Symmetry: D2
Subunit: 244 residues, 4 copies
């Protein structure tokens, strides 16, 4: 029930684990006893999160990967099985995302689909056979993060969400749970470089649920959903965004 | 491993006599919560309090019809008096199910009394009590009938869809008081009650569109309730988590 | 053309003495329906009958308090006396937007519509089909009562459609946004108004004509395979 | 008469050769619109242009492979040239269907080239032309798969859920230009295509969970398209109307 939120013996791939929400998923899962492949677009960023995990206990390995190359996604899977022996957990991060004008070049609209939909659907194809071997596992996508100037990322987030619901049918036969988190009003790095003394005091006037949560808030929900404690939770999208 | 423990924190669990609310009252108790156990039947409440004290936690029993506003005021008053405060409220008391379109209006209204009017009133009574100790967390057990459509479900589905939506609204309002509000839509739970009923032929039929192909246990739903009412869901509010192995189970 | 006409058909219409009800009443009369015009206030209902009669007869007035089951029932008996059959039912919630208070939203949006549907379906079954329509309340200030009631009523439609479908009766709902002429003046001001225009892509508020149009579509043979739909008429807004 | 006709309007209709998209162009042309009929086969759009012509309506054929951004740019400019304005865009062309989870990635990406990127680039093109007429309406034909939940449906369902959510995003971005954006999720339509495989026994399997016990006609969708693109929907934006008797119709 509190050992249900542990992952000892489990092996996890986390994409976009260099920084932000990905990073705390990787640290939270390692610290919960899982062997973890830390994957980012950026080799250096990957190795920094691994130093942080290794200096906490917990097994971790860095792998650079561009998630918009299939050859690269296969490399990650083949790497994961090479360093870990099996795969029980895939956590897939898109990356913040954020606003975009209607008249954006098509590439800029297509890019969101790689990050949030395509990469996620292919990595899920790469890891399902491994999971099935081991009598099951769990796949989890963290979608991008209020309705104007959002066609690319709101659109790609809704695709990924109904992809979760359907994947759960396809992969439930293999006893693989599929779910997603929609992260919300997160105090991210962006919003740190950009907050002045005068606003940190103005915000403290509001109640904790009316402010911003931390990436550890997404990380805690990710853990629960990928844990024995949620063994009958599938096709869910949990929005983790406080209450205004 | 401490943000999935409720040490100190004081919970009111309604309908905690049997099935889901019993299992939530016990999991909460064993995770450190002091637990007021409410049921329509004093006798069923006492069996669960006894059980929580054999296992080393602290629970008080309190008979309560959630359709009497005065009985709901007395339930809250009892919680403040034996625990000293309220941190958690698990709204499990509910009811109704398949009814024909031509039922009496009395029968249609009972659905709203059980699932809507009761829920809102108890939330509005405990809220001021939760602000004064710096906030709190409200959980309701809703139903998959709130998001599914079928013949003979007018009273039940509509009442539960209202409840599902009170979660979203209340989450906004009670945000100012630092209160979280969520719901759990449970799948088919293989409870003690059902385990009498269920032949191994019905099992096949219920799970025939359930991707994680087994029936639910009360523990599955109590695990979900533990997560949502714990500091690890401090950034989770206005949400309905469905636990049903990714499908629906007909009967 | 006449696939969006109501010639020879007989509509019951509540909340019809002002605002969205009145505009549906007149649209429907104009479309050829005989109309029972019910409002809480018998004066208001009576002016809408006389205005419909000046335009091209076939309207009848019936004071109804929709929160009392006897009043609901007399309006259903009164409606069968004057019209002979019922083909179309349009329930119009009496909710502006902003416990016994909490319950009133459920009387208007939920318990009135269901019970009126219960009285009127036996008549619709008898004549081999029909159509029922709810206008939900225009319903963040004291709207938790109206948003919950609106959500109930909306899923009532989705479910109630299965029940009445066997009887060849289609069920739908319109969930209207911020809509003027009617006594919204009450609280609108110039500040609260402009706060609605910034989150409405189509920069204008609704007229009652916006709903009555949708209402005519959903209640005509043009929408004869539409059931269990809530149509949002919000100029692009979100709820 | 007044609020539900298209006299003086100029429609581009994609996938217009058969089924739902053919009956949208015929009902639109009858409502008084000028109509650019587009299918992937110029012969298809033409047959339909002849059906329209033989009923009093001005129409024109411009073929388009919606998957190519250049034939998309060719269709846009043809309709500008032929009609003068673009007041209305009915997005109907698109494919995909059930495929297994272990599908080639090329099959998965194609569903997006068919059901999303097409819908969006073509909107990117007609939106400015619509702006300088004082507004317009865009309609897309989505799918109940965008809401429904089943096996072997990943490429189709996800992709259709993008098109459907696009609808409420484009409503916000184009409302400034006074453009309305809507969609319809059609039930099982007894098009000629379907009437040629239908058994008076699979009808029964499909009507099972279906409150108004009949399959649709392309007229049911065309009627709906006409409301949503007529000025009787002048204040309807960011909405999906599902037309399917209040049920889901399954081969399952």
């Amino acid at each position: 029930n509190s050992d249900n939120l542990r992952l000892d013996g489990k092996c996890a791939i986390i994409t976009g684990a260099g920084a932000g929400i990905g990073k705390e998923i990787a640290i939270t899962f390692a610290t919960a006893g899982a062997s973890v492949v830390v994957s980012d677009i950026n080799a250096d960023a990957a190795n920094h999160v691994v130093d942080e995990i290794q200096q906490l206990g917990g097994q971790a390995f860095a792998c650079r990967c561009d998630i918009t190359s299939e050859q690269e996604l296969s490399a990650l899977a083949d790497f994961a099985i090479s360093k870990l022996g099996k795969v029980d957990i895939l956590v897939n991060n898109a990356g913040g995302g954020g606003p975009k004008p209607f008249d954006m070049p098509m590439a800029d609209f297509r890019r969101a689909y790689e990050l949030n939909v395509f990469s996620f659907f292919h990595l899920s194809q790469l890891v399902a056979p491994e999971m099935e071997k081991n009598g099951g596992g769990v796949i989890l996508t963290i979608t991008s993060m209020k309705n104007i100037n959002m066609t690319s990322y709101a659109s790609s987030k809704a695709a990924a969400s109904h992809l979760v619901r359907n994947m759960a049918f396809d992969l439930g036969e293999k006893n693989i749970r599929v779910n997603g988190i929609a992260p919300g009003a997160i105090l991210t790095d962006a919003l740190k470089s950009v907050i002045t003394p005068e606003i940190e005091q103005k915000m403290l006037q509001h109640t904790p649920i009316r402010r911003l949560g931390q990436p550890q808030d997404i990380a805690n929900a990710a853990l629960f959903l990928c844990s024995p404690a949620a063994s009958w939770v599938s096709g869910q999208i949990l929005t983790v965004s406080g209450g205004g």
